[PDB]
Amino acid sequence: GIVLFVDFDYFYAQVEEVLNPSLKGKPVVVCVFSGRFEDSGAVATANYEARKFGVKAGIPIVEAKKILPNAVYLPMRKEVYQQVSSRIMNLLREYSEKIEIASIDEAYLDISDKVRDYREAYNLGLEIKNKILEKEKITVTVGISKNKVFAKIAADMAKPNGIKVIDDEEVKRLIRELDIADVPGIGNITAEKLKKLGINKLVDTLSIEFDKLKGMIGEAKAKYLISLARDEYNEPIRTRVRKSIGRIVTMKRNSRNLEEIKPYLFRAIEESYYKLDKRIPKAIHVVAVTEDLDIVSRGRTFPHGISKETAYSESVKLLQKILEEDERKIRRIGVRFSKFI
DNA sequence: GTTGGATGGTAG
DNA sequence: CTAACGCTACCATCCAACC
Ligand SMILES: Nc1nc2c(ncn2[C@H]2C[C@H](O)[C@@H](COP(=O)(O)OP(=O)(O)OP(=O)(O)O)O2)c(=O)[nH]1
Ligand SMILES: *Nc1ccc2c(c1)Cc1ccccc1-2
């Protein structure tokens, strides 16, 4: 059983460079502007040139501009990128039918019935890399391994513009040697709990007792880690099926004023219903981000589909509920539909 | 119990 | 106005419900 993982290089910045070859070689920062002040907002992604200087996803635009003022700042165009994204996701279909599209920029192919061994797998990788390079000018990074988690880890190790195999030998090796905080799904909070426990390596989960580990990092995460370490991890490549559409946005100034807030809430609903496209959701959630970035939400599930009209009235009763039950101002507001028929 | 909803935390 | 864009997926927990 063989899994090939593709993940596009600095994707949005790269699409801008292909849309503007002059930018190539020089720092490019794709950022969302917010409208609260001169350069309010955040960098969504930066090319590798930029990154060398500290400009990366999540930092304030006004900060990035401290560091790199001469650099090129470009407003995000999610729609332009999703189109390139989709063309690429179709080229990959041409190489395997069983494909798990994981994000705007990464997909898992199962290539078991296409290649005989990792050698042929590698070569297919090479071929995929060329094909996406020919037709879309984007460079990707490819990871090949026995399952999804380790094909991802391969890609993480190989990036910019690489291709890397992890054979059943090195899967065994990495279970013993890789920092457990590099295993997909293990972030800062989970890593600091595992260290306290004295678990630094995937193999260490077999030596600790299960109930004690459950106690710390939850059941789901426990099993996942154990399975990885036992070499039993074998979730299949399933087809992407969305469970949530949503859209939440940052207002021009903080407010508690229902009149000031609605136009945001309703532009949120219009885009969500538009993204839904034939999907009927049974549940709606209004989500507020307070003046100090704590996240608060309220919602409702109906026994039937939510019409756009019902979404309106309900989204306002939900927003009110928020303002009633929490007195902080509101910096971002938006909506999330779910539980589709 | 196992299930489902509301809300929230963690991750990518 | 004075820093923090925005997307989806999954799991944990508290807390009725339906036996
Ligand atoms: N707005 C926004 N988009 C993000 C963020 N993180 C990732 N993305 C989007 C934009 C990226 O171009 C796209 C793919 O990002 P990756 O996580 O795969 O890293 P990226 O491809 O941009 O550079 P790569 O060499 O992996 O690191 O996903 C983020 O914090 N904010
Ligand atoms: N707003 C936002 C935050 C994180 C991520 C996206 C959007 C898309 C994406 C893809 C892969 C990893 C992380 C993110």
Ligand SMILES: [Ca+2]
């Ligand atoms: Ca990616």
Ligand SMILES: [Ca+2]
């Ligand atoms: Ca990427």
Ligand SMILES: [Ca+2]
């Ligand atoms: Ca990690």
